[PDB]
Each structure stands twice: as C-alpha cells, then as structure tokens.
Amino acid sequence: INVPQLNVDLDRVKAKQLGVNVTDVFDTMQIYLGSLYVNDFNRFGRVY
Amino acid sequence: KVAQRNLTADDVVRAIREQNVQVAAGVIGASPTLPGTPLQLSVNARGRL
Amino acid sequence: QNEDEFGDIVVKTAPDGGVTHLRDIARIELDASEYGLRSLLDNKPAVA
Structure with missing residues (x-):
C-alpha cells in the first residue's frame, strides 16, 4: 500500500457556485486521464 | 403531414413513449408511517393505452 | 458515505452565489430499503 499515487480533491461548493457540474x-478527469471507450468501428468485417 | 406540422418522426416517437407508459402511482400510508395511520392505500392511474 | 454528506447535495444554486442544500428540503436518514415485512422473536427485534 505504498506505491506512489496522486490524490485529487474537488471543492464541491466552489464548483457549483462557479457554475461547474x-x-x-x-x-x-475520466476521459482525459482514463481513456473512455465510446463505441465500435468495423475493420475487415470485424468489430473493434 | 408530420413535416407540415414541423415535426420529425423522432418527435412522434417521443410522444408515443411519453403517453403510452405504465405508471408507478404510489401508496398512501405505507411503512414507515406516523402513528395512527389507519389504512394503507394503493394508487391507480390509467397509464397504458 | 453518510447522511450529512447527502445533506450537502446542492439542489439549487442561487444566481448571486447562494446554495440550497438537500437537508434544506428533506430529512436524510439511514434505514431500510423496503418496509413490507417485520421480524420479531418473542416480541423483541429479530431476523430469521
């Protein structure tokens, strides 16, 4: 339990007063840092 | 006709999904309820066409 | 994780900067997911 990581703390009140959801x-965070899967595309008749 | 009314087929599909649907109308006096409540009544509401 | 965090939910943010929280409009309690059945053992609380 001592592998290095990053903690990200989100100010909820400051977010919702600033108009951010x-x-x-x-x-x-998820899409940019975590690589969301969006949908499939076809290639040589196979789905990827 | 649908275009004449400035509608796409999606508009009518949303209308059917909206207006032909069962309803979970609720229950009056169900648990947990404050004391003295004598009856637990289910609610009906015509939802499906 | 707890009731009070669920009370902090922002149900409405006023245009000037003002936050209406969930506790303002509701009571937040930990309890049962349904209430249809009760269980006693010799008139003391129980589970079979």
Missing part, C-alpha cells in the same frame, strides 16, 4: 469535473 461535479459530473463534468469527473467526466473530464
């Missing part, structure tokens, strides 16, 4: 913050 908390799901929008989490979605940005």
Whole structure:
C-alpha cells in the first residue's frame, strides 16, 4: 500500500457556485486521464 | 403531414413513449408511517393505452 | 458515505452565489430499503 499515487480533491461548493457540474469535473478527469471507450468501428468485417 | 406540422418522426416517437407508459402511482400510508395511520392505500392511474 | 454528506447535495444554486442544500428540503436518514415485512422473536427485534 505504498506505491506512489496522486490524490485529487474537488471543492464541491466552489464548483457549483462557479457554475461547474461535479459530473463534468469527473467526466473530464475520466476521459482525459482514463481513456473512455465510446463505441465500435468495423475493420475487415470485424468489430473493434 | 408530420413535416407540415414541423415535426420529425423522432418527435412522434417521443410522444408515443411519453403517453403510452405504465405508471408507478404510489401508496398512501405505507411503512414507515406516523402513528395512527389507519389504512394503507394503493394508487391507480390509467397509464397504458 | 453518510447522511450529512447527502445533506450537502446542492439542489439549487442561487444566481448571486447562494446554495440550497438537500437537508434544506428533506430529512436524510439511514434505514431500510423496503418496509413490507417485520421480524420479531418473542416480541423483541429479530431476523430469521
């Protein structure tokens, strides 16, 4: 339990007063840093 | 006709999904309820066409 | 994780900067997921 990592703390009140959605913050972190899967594409008749 | 009314087929599909649907109408006096409540009544509401 | 964090939920943010929290509009309690059945053993609380 001592592998290095990063903690990210989100100010919820500051977010919602600043007009930012908390799901929008989490979605940005996920897509940019975590590589969301969007849908499939076909290639040589196979789905990828 | 649907275009004449400035509608796409998606509009009518949303309308059917919206207006032909069962309802979970609720229950009056169900648990947990404050004391003295004599009856537990289910609610009906015509939802499906 | 707890009731109070669920009370902190922002149900409405006022245009000037003002936050209406879930506790303002509701009571937040830990309890049962359904209430249809009760269980006693010699008139003391129980589970079979």
